[PDB]
Amino acid sequence: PEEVVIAGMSGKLPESENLQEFWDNLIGGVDMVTDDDRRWKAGLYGLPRRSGKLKDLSRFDASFFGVHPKQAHTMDPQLRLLLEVTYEAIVDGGINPDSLRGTHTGVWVGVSGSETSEALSRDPETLVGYSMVGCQRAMMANRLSFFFDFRGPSIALDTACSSSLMALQNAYQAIHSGQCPAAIVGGINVLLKPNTSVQFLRLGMLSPEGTCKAFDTAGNGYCRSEGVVAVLLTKKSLARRVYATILNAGTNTDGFKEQGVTFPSGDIQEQLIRSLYQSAGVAPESFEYIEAHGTGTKVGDPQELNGITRALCATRQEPLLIGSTKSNMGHPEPASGLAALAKVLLSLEHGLWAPNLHFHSPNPEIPALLDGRLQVVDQPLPVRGGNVGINSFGFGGSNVHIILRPNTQPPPAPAPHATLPRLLRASGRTPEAVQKLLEQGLRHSQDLAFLSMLNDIAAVPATAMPFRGYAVLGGERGGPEVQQVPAGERPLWFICSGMGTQWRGMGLSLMRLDRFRDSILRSDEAVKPFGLKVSQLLLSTDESTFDDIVHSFVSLTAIQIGLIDLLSCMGLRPDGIVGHSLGEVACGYADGCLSQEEAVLAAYWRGQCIKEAHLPPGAMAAVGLSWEECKQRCPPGVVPACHNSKDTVTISGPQAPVFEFVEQLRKEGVFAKEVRTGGMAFHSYFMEAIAPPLLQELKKVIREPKPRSARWLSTSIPEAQWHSSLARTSSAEYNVNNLVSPVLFQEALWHVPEHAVVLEIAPHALLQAVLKRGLKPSCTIIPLMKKDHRDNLEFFLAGIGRLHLSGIDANPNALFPPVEFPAPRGTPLISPLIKWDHSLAWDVPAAEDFPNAAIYNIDTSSESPDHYLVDHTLDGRVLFPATGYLSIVWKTLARALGLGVEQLPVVFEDVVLHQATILPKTGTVSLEVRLLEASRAFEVSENGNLVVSGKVYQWDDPDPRLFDHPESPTPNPTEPLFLAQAEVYKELRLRGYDYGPHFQGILEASLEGDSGRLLWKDNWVSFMDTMLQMSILGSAKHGLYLPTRVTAIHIDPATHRQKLYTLQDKAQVADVVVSRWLRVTVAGGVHISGLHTESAPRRQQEQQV
Amino acid sequence: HTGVWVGVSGSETSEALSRDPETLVGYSMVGCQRAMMANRLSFFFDFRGPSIALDTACSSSLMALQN
């Protein structure tokens, strides 16, 4: 059929936002599996701690994709990230997505989870309908088809851990058989619902250590990871970049396996590999790297690697390089295949195979690794050159395999046009995006393919990407320009300046452009018989070269026609043409009325006819007097020449009368100026004799008249007779009228529509001021060329860029020679270079949103987080702290209100401890906490028996004054001595309390026991227990007393953080004051009042006899 | 090489069976997972061909027929 290549590629993976960061983390070895607590508190349900989790899922540009704010809040995060990733994937290949709209492109998305639908579909009294319009699996591909206007198949297939490569294979089959000219294939996965991880742990697949130890001796399982990746596959014609060409790809299922459905098979995979590389016509020796599935299971790795050993290692001598991308980013279930594909493509691009982590000792069961036939990439290795294969063997039984032939297209040899500057137009959502694109383009200003691809994707409408920018790469005076396009289409008006503009050595610089050279050379051939060539005049060095009138005319018209050709090459059809003096002759070429040869002939004949006629020198002056004023003020023999502007006017006539009027005006002092016209009083009564011979010649010069489009706003014929029949067509009569009747530049300007993007097609922008002060002040003037400039090509490209900013889509690529494709290997990626409007945060399901009153299991084992409770032993039996219950109830209330504990200042009241819970040495005790928010009451229960009862409620108005230390009833001025930690706990030991190190937190205490210093670790239970201990210390009673009632407890975490002060060591401390008179214990942000303790009879175990 | 294409637009059994982490069993994934509708059939009948579970709603079955 037709060759299939991987055009685009992009996505987000664990701990990597763009594939550039992905490569940075791969090559540098940065492990991507993280222990953070983003998705859910690590260990909840005993799930393995580590897992690869994306950085953020709450970001999405709703406006760009046309999703209302309400719909965004009810959209699967996979879907939003996939829309962004697919857009980046298409543009990463240098293809504008609008170019694909309406084509038969297909979308095959791999997915195996719809948890967000379960989150949005739990409460039927409040669930909204459109939750299904953006969460159902079918909509994952259908949303892409809808936004991008893909008419091809929109299929979402699960395939059970092989979805990504299954979709890739289906897309490849589609493209091969000519069904689809392209295809967007993606793979998505997000860890949101812990129940899935619990299931996978029960099946015995997840690895307890959380590291997927691929090929190692001690592989236990695979660690779940997220990731969204998309790849654009297009036929060889549409491809602008080719990471690799998909030689072949197929699928097969393992069938009936005796060991069970989830026991992987080796013979089937070997058969698949052999069939693929036989049908593809590729000898096994060509292979240089095979991307093993490498899950890490003790069974999967041996089977898969032995299959590869039997399939590919049979005959080749040199070893086969085996890697596994799942040893870096973990294993995304559906997105596993595309993650490996991304790694392979990036490694191919950068010349080195990314190292494979967590491999130190090979699996004894896999003889290939022990021998030399099959080798692993443990440290970076260069790419010697060979085919690659990617395999994804899902746990259901579906197997896929893909063979890739890496692109090898070294950069082209240096070319003359490389030194020439280019143009870089960019567009983006926010100014940072355009600035990023411009800076990146400047970083690689010599990479022609990169510049061409960037230019191609920048032609997007203003509404989609309101910010634009153009940077001229290669020019010395080149700096980025960023601005906001005013939404709304704008007219593009051409103004061809008059015959007065011509300077020395004009257009030599711009000759370097092929189109300009072709235009000027065609003009040269046209002028041949008359005996002079335009190019020779331009390259001539005598100043008098442009002194000759006829040479001036011919050169000006030729250069203007060349500029028109350059602009036309990009695709700009003007919506209005205004011409001045000899500009009208070019205006003919602009409107299609006049052909190039006819224009050049007109210019030459005008020059010659003026030359032949002998008329006395006549100066042409400009008078700063209103038009009607110039109608009378001018002396006899002085006439209006051109109505340049409302203020500016041009006067022509004999040299003597013109000098007299200049003297008179200088007497008045009004502005007066006169351009150099060689004494040829143009547009005046002097030319009256010129026309007869001029008309006679021009009759033969221009053979057939033709219509004048409605665009062309003539200046020789006013509005009154503007309907005239002769004015209906260009002809010798037309040019004679143009020369005879005075110029009406002003009248033409009045009809320029508001917001017009004027272009000054002239070698020198002589009429810039006239247009600026004559047109409506919203007009934009962009002169293409200037005089005495060091390099006019930079100025012209800047003009085209400013045309880009105003809104007109002009592509500088056409100006320069076309670029050879596919792109050279090593062209920088484009996916990282696109930035979005992420100023808003959208919703995302929480862990509690799925099934799970609050039940807290107190496990005292060594690894459990509640180990510190073992140090709270009283009478030799470990008792739950009286402050442990309070922490549980506090956490329950915080969860109820949706806030955290640190952000919730709580107030207890009427706490009553009913029975003491003994924590078993081996086992667990389940404490259930129920709240009655209506009555502001709580009750902790144990096996249906009450343990703690009281009231809990949020502190609406915290007052830090409550925590000020009450003045002690005893001054204690001497303070000669104090009780240290060892002494205080010796005393408490003697009284019966046997606290261990964790509950040892009274750094010092006064002799009276009324003050001290409590150490602060993150544990609240220890802090409040230490407060209770400080209360007990000053008691004169003997024997151990345990809390039974507390009247009121206030906690204020903000004041708590304020009061803590770091000691001279690294440890923090909070001062504590006990006032028995007022029955208040205050320490940091905690304030206990009304503590009641009752003597608990000793256990009388008398273990000592 | 007979393949199995099943179009399915619901995994409601998984939601019910995976609600209590303190009692959920591993076999729920092997049985109630959406991708196991095709894989179970291929496993039983020894169908070595492709096994896919399409998810285009309201047209999944006829799309599987076209595939």
PDB file of C-alpha atoms in Angstrom, chain A residues 45 108 111-114 117-118 121 136-139 142 153-161 166 170 179 193 195-196 198-200 202-203 251-258 260-262 268 271 395-398 851-852 855 857, chain B residues 1-5 8-11 14-30 32-36 38-40 42-58 63-64 66-67:
ATOM      1  CA  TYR A  45      -5.342  -0.134  52.431  1.00  0.00           C
ATOM      2  CA  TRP A 108      -8.005   5.129  17.868  1.00  0.00           C
ATOM      3  CA  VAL A 111      -8.159   3.371  27.567  1.00  0.00           C
ATOM      4  CA  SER A 112      -9.034   0.935  30.333  1.00  0.00           C
ATOM      5  CA  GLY A 113     -10.633   3.114  33.015  1.00  0.00           C
ATOM      6  CA  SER A 114     -13.641   5.393  33.499  1.00  0.00           C
ATOM      7  CA  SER A 117     -17.692   8.590  35.550  1.00  0.00           C
ATOM      8  CA  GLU A 118     -18.130   6.580  38.743  1.00  0.00           C
ATOM      9  CA  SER A 121     -22.439   9.310  39.007  1.00  0.00           C
ATOM     10  CA  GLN A 136     -18.069   8.024  28.870  1.00  0.00           C
ATOM     11  CA  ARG A 137     -15.323   6.049  27.156  1.00  0.00           C
ATOM     12  CA  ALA A 138     -16.722   6.520  23.654  1.00  0.00           C
ATOM     13  CA  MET A 139     -16.409  10.284  24.076  1.00  0.00           C
ATOM     14  CA  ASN A 142     -15.432  11.262  19.795  1.00  0.00           C
ATOM     15  CA  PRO A 153     -13.330   6.088  12.584  1.00  0.00           C
ATOM     16  CA  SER A 154     -13.594   7.128  16.235  1.00  0.00           C
ATOM     17  CA  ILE A 155     -12.962   3.912  18.164  1.00  0.00           C
ATOM     18  CA  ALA A 156     -11.975   3.519  21.811  1.00  0.00           C
ATOM     19  CA  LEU A 157     -10.628   0.044  22.575  1.00  0.00           C
ATOM     20  CA  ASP A 158      -9.518  -1.416  25.903  1.00  0.00           C
ATOM     21  CA  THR A 159      -7.277  -4.412  25.047  1.00  0.00           C
ATOM     22  CA  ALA A 160      -6.392  -4.877  28.744  1.00  0.00           C
ATOM     23  CA  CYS A 161      -2.922  -3.323  29.151  1.00  0.00           C
ATOM     24  CA  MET A 166      -3.480  -2.074  19.657  1.00  0.00           C
ATOM     25  CA  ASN A 170      -5.409  -0.607  13.937  1.00  0.00           C
ATOM     26  CA  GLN A 179      -8.779   4.064   4.197  1.00  0.00           C
ATOM     27  CA  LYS A 193      -9.581   5.185  42.625  1.00  0.00           C
ATOM     28  CA  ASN A 195      -9.968   0.214  44.873  1.00  0.00           C
ATOM     29  CA  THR A 196      -8.320  -0.624  41.548  1.00  0.00           C
ATOM     30  CA  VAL A 198      -6.278  -2.911  45.965  1.00  0.00           C
ATOM     31  CA  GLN A 199      -7.596  -5.303  43.315  1.00  0.00           C
ATOM     32  CA  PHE A 200      -4.259  -5.446  41.521  1.00  0.00           C
ATOM     33  CA  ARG A 202      -4.869  -8.950  45.555  1.00  0.00           C
ATOM     34  CA  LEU A 203      -4.122 -10.498  42.167  1.00  0.00           C
ATOM     35  CA  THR A 251      -1.665  -8.662  17.002  1.00  0.00           C
ATOM     36  CA  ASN A 252      -2.506 -12.108  18.331  1.00  0.00           C
ATOM     37  CA  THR A 253      -3.984 -13.650  21.471  1.00  0.00           C
ATOM     38  CA  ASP A 254      -2.393 -16.389  23.559  1.00  0.00           C
ATOM     39  CA  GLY A 255      -5.480 -18.583  23.360  1.00  0.00           C
ATOM     40  CA  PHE A 256      -6.065 -21.297  25.937  1.00  0.00           C
ATOM     41  CA  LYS A 257      -3.205 -21.337  28.445  1.00  0.00           C
ATOM     42  CA  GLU A 258      -3.195 -24.258  30.865  1.00  0.00           C
ATOM     43  CA  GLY A 260      -4.527 -19.748  33.601  1.00  0.00           C
ATOM     44  CA  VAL A 261      -5.681 -16.669  31.714  1.00  0.00           C
ATOM     45  CA  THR A 262      -3.182 -14.323  33.381  1.00  0.00           C
ATOM     46  CA  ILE A 268       2.703 -17.270  21.033  1.00  0.00           C
ATOM     47  CA  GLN A 271       5.395 -16.820  16.745  1.00  0.00           C
ATOM     48  CA  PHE A 395      -2.470  -9.450  30.951  1.00  0.00           C
ATOM     49  CA  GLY A 396      -5.695 -10.409  29.189  1.00  0.00           C
ATOM     50  CA  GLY A 397      -3.856 -12.257  26.441  1.00  0.00           C
ATOM     51  CA  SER A 398      -3.737  -9.744  23.607  1.00  0.00           C
ATOM     52  CA  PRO A 851     -16.667   3.932  48.300  1.00  0.00           C
ATOM     53  CA  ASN A 852     -14.485   3.163  51.311  1.00  0.00           C
ATOM     54  CA  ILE A 855     -13.384   3.800  61.348  1.00  0.00           C
ATOM     55  CA  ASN A 857      -7.815   0.866  63.000  1.00  0.00           C
TER      56      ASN A 857
ATOM     57  CA  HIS B   1      -6.685 -17.098  13.996  1.00  0.00           C
ATOM     58  CA  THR B   2     -10.337 -16.326  14.711  1.00  0.00           C
ATOM     59  CA  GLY B   3     -10.643 -13.015  16.534  1.00  0.00           C
ATOM     60  CA  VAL B   4     -13.244 -11.729  18.972  1.00  0.00           C
ATOM     61  CA  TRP B   5     -14.673  -8.203  18.724  1.00  0.00           C
ATOM     62  CA  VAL B   8     -19.484  -2.988  25.313  1.00  0.00           C
ATOM     63  CA  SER B   9     -20.574   0.316  26.848  1.00  0.00           C
ATOM     64  CA  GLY B  10     -20.788  -0.606  30.515  1.00  0.00           C
ATOM     65  CA  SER B  11     -18.670  -2.032  33.331  1.00  0.00           C
ATOM     66  CA  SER B  14     -16.880  -3.734  38.509  1.00  0.00           C
ATOM     67  CA  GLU B  15     -18.294  -0.736  40.362  1.00  0.00           C
ATOM     68  CA  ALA B  16     -20.462  -2.933  42.578  1.00  0.00           C
ATOM     69  CA  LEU B  17     -17.774  -5.535  43.276  1.00  0.00           C
ATOM     70  CA  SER B  18     -14.996  -3.029  44.067  1.00  0.00           C
ATOM     71  CA  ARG B  19     -16.679  -0.929  46.740  1.00  0.00           C
ATOM     72  CA  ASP B  20     -15.246  -2.436  49.929  1.00  0.00           C
ATOM     73  CA  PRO B  21     -11.431  -2.615  49.940  1.00  0.00           C
ATOM     74  CA  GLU B  22     -11.650  -4.724  53.108  1.00  0.00           C
ATOM     75  CA  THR B  23     -13.551  -7.468  51.259  1.00  0.00           C
ATOM     76  CA  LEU B  24     -12.862  -7.048  47.528  1.00  0.00           C
ATOM     77  CA  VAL B  25     -11.173 -10.010  45.859  1.00  0.00           C
ATOM     78  CA  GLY B  26      -8.639  -9.980  43.056  1.00  0.00           C
ATOM     79  CA  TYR B  27     -10.702 -12.151  40.723  1.00  0.00           C
ATOM     80  CA  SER B  28     -13.068  -9.227  40.120  1.00  0.00           C
ATOM     81  CA  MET B  29     -10.580  -7.772  37.629  1.00  0.00           C
ATOM     82  CA  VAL B  30     -10.138 -11.038  35.722  1.00  0.00           C
ATOM     83  CA  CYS B  32     -15.623  -8.056  35.592  1.00  0.00           C
ATOM     84  CA  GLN B  33     -13.071  -5.916  33.739  1.00  0.00           C
ATOM     85  CA  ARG B  34     -14.325  -4.561  30.428  1.00  0.00           C
ATOM     86  CA  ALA B  35     -11.346  -5.838  28.440  1.00  0.00           C
ATOM     87  CA  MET B  36     -11.979  -9.391  29.671  1.00  0.00           C
ATOM     88  CA  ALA B  38     -13.064 -10.503  24.534  1.00  0.00           C
ATOM     89  CA  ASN B  39     -10.102 -12.093  26.306  1.00  0.00           C
ATOM     90  CA  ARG B  40     -12.270 -14.574  28.206  1.00  0.00           C
ATOM     91  CA  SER B  42     -10.534 -16.073  23.236  1.00  0.00           C
ATOM     92  CA  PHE B  43      -9.168 -17.968  26.232  1.00  0.00           C
ATOM     93  CA  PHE B  44     -12.072 -20.409  26.263  1.00  0.00           C
ATOM     94  CA  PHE B  45     -12.277 -21.093  22.535  1.00  0.00           C
ATOM     95  CA  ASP B  46      -8.536 -20.933  21.731  1.00  0.00           C
ATOM     96  CA  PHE B  47      -8.975 -17.986  19.355  1.00  0.00           C
ATOM     97  CA  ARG B  48      -5.411 -16.866  18.623  1.00  0.00           C
ATOM     98  CA  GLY B  49      -6.574 -13.864  16.596  1.00  0.00           C
ATOM     99  CA  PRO B  50      -7.132 -10.303  17.777  1.00  0.00           C
ATOM    100  CA  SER B  51      -9.205  -9.650  20.892  1.00  0.00           C
ATOM    101  CA  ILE B  52     -10.622  -6.138  21.245  1.00  0.00           C
ATOM    102  CA  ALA B  53     -13.436  -4.541  23.244  1.00  0.00           C
ATOM    103  CA  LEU B  54     -14.787  -1.560  21.314  1.00  0.00           C
ATOM    104  CA  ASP B  55     -16.399   1.351  23.124  1.00  0.00           C
ATOM    105  CA  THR B  56     -18.268   3.499  20.568  1.00  0.00           C
ATOM    106  CA  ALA B  57     -21.656   3.803  22.246  1.00  0.00           C
ATOM    107  CA  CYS B  58     -24.850   3.004  20.338  1.00  0.00           C
ATOM    108  CA  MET B  63     -18.586  -1.229  14.438  1.00  0.00           C
ATOM    109  CA  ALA B  64     -17.146  -4.496  15.743  1.00  0.00           C
ATOM    110  CA  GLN B  66     -17.259  -3.833  10.421  1.00  0.00           C
ATOM    111  CA  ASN B  67     -13.849  -4.475  11.988  1.00  0.00           C
TER     112      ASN B  67
END
